Each structure stands twice: as structure tokens, then as C-alpha cells.
Amino acid sequence: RGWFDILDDWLKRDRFVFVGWSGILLFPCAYLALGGWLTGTTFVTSWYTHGLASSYLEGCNFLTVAVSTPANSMGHSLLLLWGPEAQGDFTRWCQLGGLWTFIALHGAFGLIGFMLRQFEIARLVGVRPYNAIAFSAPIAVFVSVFLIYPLGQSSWFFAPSFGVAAIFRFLLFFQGFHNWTLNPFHMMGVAGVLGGALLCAIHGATVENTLFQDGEGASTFRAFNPTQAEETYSMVTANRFWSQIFGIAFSNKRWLHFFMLFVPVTGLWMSAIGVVGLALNLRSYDFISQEIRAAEDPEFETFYTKNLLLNEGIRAWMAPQDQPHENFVFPEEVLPRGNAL
Amino acid sequence: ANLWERFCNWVTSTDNRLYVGWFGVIMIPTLLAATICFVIAFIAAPPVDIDGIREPVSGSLLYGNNIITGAVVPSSNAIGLHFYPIWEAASLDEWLYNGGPYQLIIFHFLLGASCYMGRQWELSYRLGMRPWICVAYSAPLASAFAVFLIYPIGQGSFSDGMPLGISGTFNFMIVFQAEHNILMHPFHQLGVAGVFGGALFCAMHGSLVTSSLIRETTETESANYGYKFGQEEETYNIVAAHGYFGRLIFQYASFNNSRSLHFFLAAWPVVGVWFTALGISTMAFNLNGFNFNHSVIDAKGNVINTWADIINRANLGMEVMHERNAHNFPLDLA
Amino acid sequence: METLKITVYIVVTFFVLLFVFGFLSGDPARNPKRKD
Amino acid sequence: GFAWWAGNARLINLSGKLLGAHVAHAGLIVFWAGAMTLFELAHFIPEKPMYEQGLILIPHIATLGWGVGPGGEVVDTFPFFVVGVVHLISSAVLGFGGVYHAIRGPETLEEYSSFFGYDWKDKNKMTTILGFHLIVLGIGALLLVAKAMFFGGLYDTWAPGGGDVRVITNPTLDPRVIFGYLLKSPFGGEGWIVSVNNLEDVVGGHIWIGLICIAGGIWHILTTPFGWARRAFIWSGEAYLSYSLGALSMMGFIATCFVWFNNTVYPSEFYGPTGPEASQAQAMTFLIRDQKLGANVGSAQGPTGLGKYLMRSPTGEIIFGGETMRFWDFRGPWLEPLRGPNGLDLNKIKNDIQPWQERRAAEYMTHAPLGSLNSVGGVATEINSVNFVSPRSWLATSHFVLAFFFLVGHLWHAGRARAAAAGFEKGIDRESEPVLSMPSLD
Amino acid sequence: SYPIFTVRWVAVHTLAVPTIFFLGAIAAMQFIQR
Amino acid sequence: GTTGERPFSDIITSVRYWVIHSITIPALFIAGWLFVSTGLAYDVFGTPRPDSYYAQEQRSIPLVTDRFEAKQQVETFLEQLK
Amino acid sequence: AELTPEVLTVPLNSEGKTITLTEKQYLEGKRLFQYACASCHVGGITKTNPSLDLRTETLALATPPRDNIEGLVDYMKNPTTYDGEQEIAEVHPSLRSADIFPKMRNLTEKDLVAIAGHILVEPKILGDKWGGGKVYY
């Protein structure tokens, strides 16, 4: 009953916001990541890294503000405040993109803290740790997209900037440059996200429309007691309904709920892997057989060839402004263009 | 015991392995017609002049496509929104060239899917259930109406409806982004929120229930065998689950009422998808996403670019390249 | 082609009539509780 | 048994308070008609076309003949002020009756008077209220006829000389024309009732529907539903609501398409050009410009081998080329002077294009119904500068959204009415679970 | 009988206080003219 | 289900609560306001004022192009307007 | 950078005399350009005839030269084709044709100067962008 156990007691007390040992890592880092994002989107520019306004102070709105990535010339610098780029000068640190690494790194450590919190509370309360396990999917996506991806590329510059439209720009980049929609790891992610949303809506709807009449009122919500042992809806009527509408139906509530965990978590892990490949430009860009035929046969056209012309429009039209450090100058006569437009 | 009453009793029978019902009287044929034409077209249809410029697009496996690139190609721009059944062609050869199968498939499928939603009401009624599962399915169905019918109506042509193909789906969404800046449209933003959130809440609910299953099995058997079909007792401990989740956030951010929780599970994705269906359906009438192009300028009047301007650069590259031989005039007004 | 058109018209009308007359044949009464 | 959030469901069997709600709500609708018009008028500037100005009520009024003259020039704004004022004043009268019945009047009506009181399950009384409202509606439709035929006429975009107000003296009575619109396919080049393209047909249809509505109103006050009808429907207030939601939904979708395609009763002088119209107008604009430079627009082969300016439609008609090939079913007053029997007539095109048609094509081309949600006009890649979104995009999108949700409302209340009527809207009786008494599927 | 200052109190003001300060700054911002 | 803190609905319906917070809330709003209105925010964070994105006869972006001289590069750009 | 008097100084006529616009003038001319002209001339191009733009260099080669306040004011009253050979009031907004172009009705002589001045100032601010089209957006 020495000091470590006394502190344990206090961290683990039942209060409005549970703290735990995990809170020591989580609460500073989450607060700082959030704080950094609100600070930069309110007050901080991207003039010197991107040639962009990016704060409310500058004229931007909620959709176009962003904490933008550092300049390509920073490489993968940690851009510490006390480091050799900013040399303790908070102002220069801001203008150099310091808040991007600040947010990404504290965010990373916050996510570790959050997942440790799911472990810590689960242990104290006596549950199994499947929510912590399910949260690995968010972590894998964050690390693969925000950290692994730019680490394979030339710089943090090509990571996603923290902003609504900046991320929209990230999506469009990955189409024109990586042809990411043609990637089977993205496609399984899509199936996971949409499969999860479907499961979510279809499971809630089913439960709500196979309710037992447990009260006289027309609001059926009241007719639930959280301590009742009885199932509040008929699994048997639900199973007959779906067997006859769709052919197959769940029969096991445990498998049902485990499937709901499995699908969106698997989908996100899959897409994380594809992004790892794209860190290296290891893209699912082309089908070799299509290009051989199309090169030899000017009448061969597929939706595949049509989208690559779209990708080529995007690259030539967006790269000068989106990669200012490359000093691309494309005269009018080199821009790829269809007729009239 | 009357012949018609016998048929009526077979139609609505709750003892059929798949329920038929009156909606199904329409659904079975129209889905069979759509499915059969689609399978045959995906495999063997010849190239279709989707944009009406005598530039046929190959979509089928036998003409050099794989699973990812294949499509049933939309019907020709030359047809517009005109009805092009088989019997309006001089020959099947002509109907194939101009994209007739696409029209056949999408009209049967939309009918059959609409009857699918009705069939869901119908069996709910015969089984003594509550009625609103079909309301959840109206979210996906409205979304299919948007990209197959409403958007073609507003733009004037089924040639701009979504292809029945994996890569054609992508073409559609790229060209939609350049003509409508859908990413900057708040209804698409809400659909992303319905779909990300639905997946999130799917995972949450499945992990919280799975976290609080009551010990009923040994280490050497799946815990699934701890639930038996039609048992009356709950198989998990929602008070344990509420106690974890409310401490993970705080108490009043966690459900302790299963009925509210499952209703929330139903409501969130259904409504975000309604909006995103509505997003496609209103961009059908060219009420496009927010435009912040050159919205920031400096004291002199120089443009100061934002990330919206960068988006615009990408959008331009999509605009100038798409349907590259189909425009003769400077504005792509539809 | 006219033969085909004839056939589809007849096939379709047939199914639409099944549907209308089906639902006019006392559908409210085809439930498991209160039939009327 | 309802929660605060289903609180109006408490009014189902309170016929007097429910009258208060319906009448108070009618007053909000009249209020908005009133106030929006005064707002539109306070902002209106006549040097500018209506469609550059965000107006949707003033164009409805103009279309009825009031306040406009030849070509849609606004001549006198006082009819606009009057319509808004009168609506506005009238909403206080509706507000008063409304809150009186909802707060202070008799809570239920059936004790105070057997006439105004009703039970939803009284198939005879329900059809009588329906019959009264049909008659009212028939009167409504005749008031349009009366305006067209006896009190000034209507704006006719198709009037020779640019458009003008015109009295309608031979409304179409031929049922083959009137009901023939009801049998045209909704597809391209047909357009079901949205294709109606002259006021004679508009006015004759309203004569028909006026009489039909009065006939049927009268019919339903005198009859009770026959037995097949009795056995087909649910007879409850929520079921009746669900029927009307279905109908309003269908009607909203029809209106969406009407305002998008029809330039007759939504004149383009007032509402802006249709999508097809604007697209056609661009091909006209560059045909005109290029022919003035010496191009022979009929013999100019475009890059695809199709004509650059002119090509054939799938049934032969000479039409504009480029992507607007999709839009050849378009008809409008500025373009029809160029149509011969085979479509666009090449000799008229070379010789008889008028300055006013050149102006109109340029104007419509540059006011195509494309715009951002923050009202930046033009294609989605356009820069800021022009503050414009077509009334037709505003009216199409808004009413598609309302139509959509009213279909969802129909499903909600139709399903719920069926379940309440059968006794399981609140859930499955644990002791009498239907499935547990059926054989298993396998 | 309740305490005033708690862990809860700190978490609340930790978020509430700069929120308002940030709202004030962003309100002033709508009156900047180029 | 309580852990002993004063209920929120108790606090914000209380007079002492509003007596303190009708001062603290406007005072912070006002501080936030003055942070911008004085121009301090621009200097603290280095954000260009509307008149200092470009030199007058200039449309090049002042882009950082070096990792270890980046700090000097920016200063060189700032003096190129004074 | 800012909107100095040098940028606000533009040729008044061919003879070489100049005039310095106030910022108020410039802003008012921009607004009147949006009200009366941008539906076809957004960004300094011409949507209904892209071969002719409002770049100073194009206006200097127009007959009557239009790269000056007087040229532009006159154009808004009696527009010609680029070579001066034919008057085009019937299809181009002008005071001469405010009957058929009603937005021109309420325009005073000083409005026209503002419009004209904005046209001449704007390429000094935006350069290639002004009249360059989507390639420069």
C-alpha cells in the first residue's frame, strides 16, 4: 500500500469522466491534437508550404480551412518546435507546417491511449475486449494513410492535409495518380463500409419491427426494462421473415453480432493494405492486356480506357498548382483536352 | 375452395419457402427478365454507341473485357429519353448497337426492386409484424432510382445514367464530380456520414454485444453455441455493456434501452442515405455543390487559392477530357 | 417485331390484372389477427 | 399513448382540436404566399429578367396575365402587391379560426353538431366531406377558365410577336385531345401531360376537370362506397392520411418534371430557359456565329463524321448536333420559325434568322439552369462572378425532395394503418406469436 | 452537498473556455475587409 | 447511476452559476475578439495580412524550398515587402 | 500588394492621356460589370464568341481602338465589330439598344466610366487569368 497503489486507486475511481493509467497518455494527446487542429484552422495559413489560404482569419470557411502538410522540402522531418528547422521560433514553426506533424503525432499517440482505455475499462468492468479489438481498424487506417503513406513518398507534403476540402483533394489525387478505385484492396474496403452500413440499418430495422408487445403504449420504447432477462424482439419471427424474403436469415444472435464486428473491421484493414502499396506507387493502375490491344487497335474502347483519359486530365490540369515546389509549367498546347472543352 | 380463391391462397401463403404475394407476382417476372438479359449482355453483347457519336464502347467479356472492366453500356445519346423496346428496332442488330438491353434491364429491375420493397411490407403484414422494414430499404431503392432514372431524366438522356459495370460505375462518379462538384455538396457529405457512421455503429454494436456475452461454453467450442435459436433469455448482458461503454465515454452517451439503440442503428444510415439519394436526384437538376472558386482574394485583387481551387483544377481535368469527341461547343450544358 | 410487341402487351396486362384483382380480393383480411 | 414527438397523433379522435390544427396550418400557407410575394416585390427590379432575381411567386402571377405585357415586360406591379396583401390579410382570419378551434373551441365536434362532427369509420360521412371538397376544387379549376376566357386571359409565350396576354375564346373540348394527353407515354418526344403546349388545351382540360370534380363531388355526397371498395381499403384516419400522402407524392414528382420541361405554362421569359432549351440555344448561337463568318453549316462534317451543326435524329428529323442531339424534342417560340416539315429547314437557317432570335439564343444559352448551391451561375468549374440559379432548378429540386419524403410518409402511415387496423402495431403478442403456430419452412 | 471543483469541472472548462475565446475571434473576423 | 458530482441541470439553472458566467463568457468572447481586432493573431501565428501575400509587382508564391534555411527563406520573403 | 493609384491609372484616350480611378470607382465598375456584362464576359472572355476577349492587347487591335476609357465608353453606346465595319447594337447591349437590352436603361455616364475602368484595371491585377479562360482558373 505504497505510492503506486495509492495513485492506482485514484486514477481508477468511478467519476463522471473515467481517467485510468491510460488517461495520462490519452487526455493530453487527444486534447493537443484537437487543439492544434482548431488553432491552425482558425489562425494559421498555408502560404509558405502550399501557396494557399487555409484559416478563418484568412477568409476560409469550414469546408476549405485545413492544417496543411509541411512543404515538400521538409522531407519526413519530425518538425519539432525545438528542432533545426524552426529553432524554437513558434511563428516560423507554424508557417513551416509544424502543426501538421504536431497533430499527426499527438493524434497517433492519442489513438494508442484511446485503445488502451478500451483495454483498461474492459478489464475493470469484467467484459471481453472486443471493442478494443474492433478499434484496430481505425488505427490501421490512420497509420497507413497519415504516416506510412507519405513515408514511402518524398515527404509529408503528399500526406492528407487535415481539412474537409483538402481531403476531397486527397481523394481526387488518388484517382488521377494512383487509379485507386481500380484497386481490389480499396474495393473490399468499400464492401466493408457499405456492408456495415447495410448491416447497421437492416439489423436495427429488424429488431424494431419484430418487437414483442410488452406495453400498451404506442411508443414502444417505454416497454423495455434494461434488467429484463427476456429478449425484447422475436428472433424466430425475424428469422422466418428474412428466410422467406431473402432466402437465408440469421438464426444465431451471437454470430449475427460477431458478423457486424467482422465486416467493417475487415473492410478497413483491407484498404489499409492497399494504401501501404500506394506508399510505394505499387498501384493497381493498368491491365496490361487492355493496353496492348488498345495500342494496336484504335477502335477498342472500354470504360477502363475512358477512365485513364480522365486520370490524365486530372494529372496535367492539377499538378502545377497542387505541387508548386516542382515548378511545373505546362503551356496551353501541352494540356490534354477533348474537343471544344 | 373456388379456383380463384385457391390461387389467392397460394399467392399469399405463409408456408411457401420463398414468399410470393401480390407484389411478387410482378417482381418474379421483371427480375427474371432483367437478370437474364444482364447475364447474356455482360457475356456477349457487342459494342454500344453510348454517346451517340458512332464510337462504340465494348462492355462484354467476349469482346475483350474482364470482370472489372465489363459493363452493360447505357443506351445511345441519340435516343435521349425515348423509349427503345426491342419492337422499336429494325433488327436486334440495331437494338444491340444503340444500347437497348440497358433500357430493358433497368426498367425491369426498377419495377422489380420497387415490388421488392412492397413484398417486404406484405409479408410483414401476413406474419403479424410491424411494417417499416420496407422503409429502411427505401433508402437503397431511392438511390438506385437516382442514378438509373432521375439523373437521366434531368440531364435528358439514359446515356448519362450509371453503367452496369464496375469500371463504368467509376466513370460515372468521376464525370459526376466534374459536372456537379458532388464532394462539396452537403447531401453527399451526409451520405458519407450515414455510411461511415453506419459502419462505425455496426462495429460498435457488434463489439459491445460480443463483449458482453454470458459464459455458456468452454474454451474448446465456439461461443456461438451458447445461443440456441428461439431461447427466451437474452444471450448478452446489456447492463455490463452499458457499464463499459458509458465509462468509455460518459454515462449518458450510452444507451441502456435496447429499443432506442436499435432504432438509432436503423435511423442513422437510412437517413444519411436518403439525403445522398436526394443529392444525386437534385444534382439531376443542376443544383450543384458549393463553389468557392476564387472566393479568397488579397488587397490588390490577386486570387489567393484555397483547397477548393485545387479541387477545381482536378475537376477541370475531368471536364476537358470526358467524352472527348462528343462536344462541339464550349459549354457542356448537359 | 409486332408479334413480339403483341406478346409483351398481353403478358404484361395479364400480370397487372393479377396484381389489381389480387389486392381487391379482400387483402386486409389476409392477416393473422383480426380479419375484416 | 403517444410521446411528445408523436404528439399530433393525439388529435386523431379530437375532431375540434384537429380542425384548429388544419385551419391554423392553412393560415401559415396563406401567410407565406402573402409574405413571400411582398418580399419578392420589395426586391423586384423590372429592368432585370425575373429569373435573374430569385422569383418564384411573381412568375406564377405574371403567367395568369397580371402585370405583364408584350414579351413579358412588366408593365404594372400593383397586381403583385394586391395578391400578396390579400393573401397576407387572409392568413390572420385563418390564424384566428385556427387557434380558436385548437385552444378554446369545443375539443370534439360530434356532440356540438351532427353535421360538422365525424367519425373516421363513417364511410358515408367521409365520402360526403370528400364530395364537398371535390366541388370546391372543381370551382377552383373553373376560376382558371374564367380568368382565361372572361377576365383578361393568360400569358401566351407562343403568341405571335414575342408573347403577350391573350384571351382564350376556343378552349379545346375534344376529349380525344384532352384525354389523349393522359394516354401519351411519359418518355421522350411524348412527355405525357407535360407536353401540353398551347393555352387552348390548358383551358379545356380545366373545364373538363372542373365538371368532373363537381360530378364526382356530387356523386360522393349521394353514395356510400360499394362492397368491393369496402373490402379493399382500411377505414381509419391514418389510412386516409396515407392515401393523400401517396397522391401528393405522385403530384410532386409530376410538378418537378413540369417545371423542368414545360415552357408553355412555365414561360421561359419568366422562369428562365429549360435545360433542353439552353442546350439547343448554344448550338443555335454558334451556328449563327459561324455562318456569319462563311461556314456552310449544313455541309460541315464534325470530328465524329456527324454534322458539326446539324444532323439527323433517329427518325430522320434535321436537328442540332453535338451533345444536344439528346434535346431535339425541344420546342420553343424562338426556334419553331425555323422548322420545316423535315425538321430544321436549311434555307430558313441561311436566310431568315432574325436579330431577336440571335439575342434570345444568346440569352438562354448564358442562363442555362446550372448553378452552385451558393448561387454561382454556370458549370461547376466556373469562377465566382455571376450570382444566379434558375428558378427551374430551385423548383425542380425542392419539389423532388418533398415528393420523395411524402412517398416515405405514405409507406410509414400506410404500413402503420394496416398494422393498427389488424391489432399488431405495438408488437407481437408473446402468448399468440403467429409464426410459432405455423409449420416450419423446412 | 457537492464539490465545486472536480476532475469533471476541469475537463469542462478545458474545452469550454477556449471555445468562447475562439468564437469571439471568429466573430471579429467577419468584419475584416481586404 | 451517479458518481457524486453536482448535476449539470442543477448547475445551469442556478443563480450563482449565471452570476459568475454572465461575466466570464462575454469577457472571453471579448478577449478572442480583441486578439483579432488588434492584429495580434496575425503576428503570433505569422499569417499574411490581406496586403502582404505578394509584393506589389509580384505573383510568385514565396515557397519554402530548403529544409534548414527555411526559417531564413521566410524572413527573406517578409523583408521583400517592407 | 494593394490597389495603388498606379494600378488604378489607365489610358483615357488614344492621344496618351490618362486618368486615375478611385478605388470606389473600381469597385463600382466591378459591380456594374457583374450586373450588366458578366453573364457573357465572366473572367474577361466572351462565352458567346470566345474568339474575342477583353484583354487589353485584343482591345488595342480593335478598330476604333478600345484599350482606353473613351473607346470603351463609346463601345457601350454604339458597339461595332472588331474591324469597325458594322454596328451591332441589335445583338449587343448598349445604350443605343437599351430598348431591347433593358439592363442598360438605368446606366449613367459615370457608370460607363466605371465599367470601362474596371475592364482596363483588371488585367493589371490578374494578368493572364483575365480573358485566359478555364486554363488559368
Ligand code: CLA
Ligand atoms: C403547424 C404546426 C402545428 C400545429 C398547428 C399543431 C397544433 C396542435 N398541437 Mg401539435 N406539434 C407540432 C406542430 C403543430 N401542432 C410539432 C412540431 C410538435 C413537436 C414539438 C408538436 C407536438 C405536440 C404535442 C406534444 C401535443 C400537440 C398538441 C396540439 C394541439 C393542442 C395544443 C395545445 O393545447 O397547446 C396549448 C398551447 C398553448 C396554450 C401555447 C400558445 C399557443 C398559441 C396557439 C400560439 C399562437 C401564436 C400566434 C402568433 C397567435 C396569433 C393570433 C391571431 C391570429 C389572433 C393543437 C391542435 C397537443 C394535443 O394533441 O392535445 C391533445 C399535444 O399534446 N402537439
Ligand code: CLA
Ligand atoms: C374549414 C374550416 C372550418 C370549419 C369546418 C369550421 C367549423 C365550425 N366552426 Mg369555425 N372558423 C373557421 C373555419 C372553420 N370552422 C374560421 C376561418 C374562423 C375564423 C374566421 C372560425 C371561427 C369560429 C368561431 C368563432 C366559432 C366557430 C364555430 C364553428 C362550428 C359552427 C359553425 C356554424 O354554426 O356556422 C355556420 C356557418 C356560417 C355562419 C358560415 C357563413 C358563410 C361563410 C362565412 C362564407 C364561406 C367562406 C368561403 C367558402 C371561403 C372564404 C373566402 C376567401 C377565399 C376570400 C363548426 C364546427 C363555433 C363553435 O365552435 O361553437 C362554439 C364558434 O363559436 N368557428
Ligand code: CLA
Ligand atoms: C387534376 C388535374 C390537373 C392538372 C393536370 C392541372 C395542370 C395544370 N394546372 Mg390546374 N388546377 C386543377 C387541376 C389540375 N391542373 C384544379 C383542381 C385546380 C383548382 C384547385 C386548378 C387550378 C389551377 C390554377 C389556378 C392554375 C393551374 C395551373 C396548371 C398548370 C401548371 C401547374 C402545374 O404544373 O401543375 C401540374 C399538375 C399536377 C401536379 C396535378 C396532377 C394530378 C394527377 C395527374 C392526378 C392525381 C389523381 C389523384 C391522386 C386522385 C386519385 C383519385 C383516386 C380515387 C383514383 C398545369 C397545366 C396554372 C396554369 O394553368 O397557368 C396557366 C395556374 O395558374 N391550375
Ligand code: CLA
Ligand atoms: C380526390 C379524389 C377522389 C377520391 C379520393 C375518391 C375516392 C373514391 N371514389 Mg371517387 N370519384 C372522383 C374523385 C375521387 N374519388 C371523381 C372526381 C369522380 C367522377 C368521375 C369519381 C367517381 C367515382 C365512382 C364512379 C366511383 C368512385 C368510388 C370511389 C371509392 C373507391 C375508389 C377506388 O377504388 O379507387 C381505386 C381505383 C381503382 C381500383 C381503379 C382505377 C383505375 C385507373 C383509371 C387506373 C390508372 C392508373 C395509372 C397508374 C394512373 C395514371 C393516369 C392514367 C389514367 C393514364 C373511393 C371512396 C367508387 C365507389 O365506391 O363509389 C361509391 C365508384 O364506384 N368514385
Ligand code: HEC
Ligand atoms: C456589359 C455592358 C458589357 C460590356 C461592357 C461589354 N459586353 Fe460584350 N460581347 C459579346 C459578343 C458576342 C461580342 C463580340 C461582338 C462581335 O464583335 O461580333 C462582345 C464584344 C464585346 C467587346 C469587344 C471585345 C474586343 O476584343 O474588341 C466589349 C468591349 C464588350 N463586349 C463589352 C457578348 C456580350 C453579351 C452576351 C449577351 C453581353 C451581355 C455582353 N457582351 C455585355 C457586355
Ligand SMILES: CC1=C(/C=C/C(C)=C/C=C/C(C)=C/C=C/C=C(C)/C=C/C=C(C)/C=C/C2=C(C)CCCC2(C)C)C(C)(C)CCC1
Ligand atoms: C496548438 C498548440 C497548443 C495547444 C493549443 C490548444 C490546446 C488549443 C485549444 C483550442 C480550442 C479548444 C479551441 C476551441 C474552439 C472551438 C470552436 C471554434 C467551436 C466552434 C463551434 C461552433 C461553430 C458550433 C456551432 C454549432 C453549429 C454550427 C451547428 C450545431 C450547433 C452548434 C452550436 C454546435 C499549445 C498551447 C500546447 C502550444 C503549441 C501549439
Ligand SMILES: CC1=C(/C=C/C(C)=C/C=C/C(C)=C/C=C/C=C(C)/C=C/C=C(C)/C=C/C2=C(C)CCCC2(C)C)C(C)(C)CCC1
Ligand atoms: C395551434 C398551435 C400552434 C400553431 C399555431 C398557428 C400555426 C398559428 C397561425 C396563426 C397565423 C397564421 C397568424 C396570422 C397572422 C397574420 C397577421 C396578424 C397579419 C397581419 C397583417 C398586417 C398587419 C398587414 C399590414 C400590411 C399591409 C396591410 C400592407 C403591406 C404592409 C403591411 C404588411 C404592414 C403551435 C404549433 C405554435 C402550438 C400548438 C397550437
Ligand SMILES: CC1=C(/C=C/C(C)=C/C=C/C(C)=C/C=C/C=C(C)/C=C/C=C(C)/C=C/C2=C(C)CCCC2(C)C)C(C)(C)CCC1
Ligand atoms: C386539367 C388539364 C388537363 C387535363 C387533365 C385531366 C383530364 C386529368 C385526368 C386525370 C385522371 C383522370 C387521373 C386518374 C388517376 C387515377 C389514379 C391515380 C388511380 C389510382 C389507383 C390506385 C391507387 C389503386 C390502388 C389499388 C389497387 C390497384 C388494388 C386494390 C387496392 C388499391 C385500391 C389500393 C390537360 C392534361 C389536358 C392539360 C392541362 C390541364
Ligand SMILES: CCCCCCCCCCCCCCCCCC(=O)O
Ligand atoms: C512524454 C513527452 C512529453 C514531451 C512534451 C514536450 C514538452 C513541451 C515542449 C515545449 C518546447 C518549447 C521549447 C522551444 C524553445 C527551444 C529553443 C531552441 O531551439 O533551442
Ligand code: OEX
Ligand atoms: O454524356 Mn455523359 O456527359 Ca453529362 O455533360 Mn454533357 O453530357 Mn456527356 O457531356 Mn459532360
Ligand SMILES: [Cl-]
Ligand atoms: Cl468519359
Ligand SMILES: [Cl-]
Ligand atoms: Cl456540344
